[PDB]
């Protein structure tokens, strides 16, 4: 087509979605991790994660207001990834890299899994 | 902080939100324009438009599944702006610029209003 494009549009949209999350506006699901609860927007979770995409396209699960993650999932690893989903920023540190990679593999967040693999390979 | 950032994350999220819109997945509102109906996600509309932000933060309207726009709003102008919201691409043409600018002013989409003003000023 002959469209023009606003370079900062996608980033501005994501920033506003994160402001709605902060203020708990129109959040439609609670993700439960080892008795730690995280409120979010189903559409953002689906846009970022192959696991949430499969969950919320399921005819029965699409209607659930609570999703319980596998007990092996670490709440801090989930929190870091949820922050990444809404900001593009990943708080990757020596002390959390193993939990973050394991959570990203479970959530099916391929780009996060890739950088964790590379950061681990550099330290060996 | 000491975060790393994935450059293409915001664009990838928006692209996936547009794929959900195409497939009518988790759309939670119908916008009615001069008897033309457009399905969308309330959170994306709020992230892009000052008007939808005000509408869906209102305690009564946040719960509506149908929103009727002012009868002076042109459906094509709305369609072009809805596409912009989900893609960052604006199909601005000599034949639609007046309808697009009037719709962007009503929807409170300041960056769109700005480029329409500049494109109109260049043609005078």
């Amino acid at each position: 087509d002959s469209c023009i494009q606003f370079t900062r549009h996608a980033s501005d949209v994501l920033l506003n979605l994160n402001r709605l999350r902060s203020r708990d506006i129109l959040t439609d699901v609670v993700i439960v991790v080892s008795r730690e609860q995280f409120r979010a927007h189903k559409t953002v979770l689906m846009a970022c994660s192959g696991l949430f995409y499969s969950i919320f396209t399921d005819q029965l699960k699409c209607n659930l207001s609570v999703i319980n993650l596998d007990p092996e999932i670490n709440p801090e690893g989930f929190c870091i990834l949820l922050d990444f989903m809404y900001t593009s920023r990943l708080n990757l540190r020596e002390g959390n890299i193993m939990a973050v990679m394991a959570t990203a593999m479970y959530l099916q967040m391929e780009h996060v899994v890739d950088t964790c693999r590379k950061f681990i390979k550099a330290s060996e | 902080d000491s975060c790393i950032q994935f450059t293409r994350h915001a664009s990838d999220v928006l692209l996936n939100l547009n794929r959900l819109r195409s497939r009518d997945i988790l759309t939670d509102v119908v916008i009615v324009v001069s008897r033309e109906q457009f399905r969308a996600h309330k959170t994306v509309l709020m992230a892009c438009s000052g008007l939808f932000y005000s509408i869906f933060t209102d305690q009564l309207k946040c719960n509506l599944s149908v929103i009727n726009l002012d009868p002076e709003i042109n459906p094509e102008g709305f369609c072009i702006l809805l596409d912009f919201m989900y893609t960052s691409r604006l199909n601005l043409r000599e034949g639609n610029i007046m309808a697009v600018m009037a719709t962007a002013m009503y929807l409170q989409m300041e960056h769109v209003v700005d480029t329409c003003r500049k494109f109109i000023k260049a043609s005078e």
Binding site: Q5, F6, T7 | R89, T115
Partner: peptide, 4 residues
């Protein structure tokens, strides 16, 4: 704004 840019030409994509």
């Amino acid at each position: 704004w840019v030409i994509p």
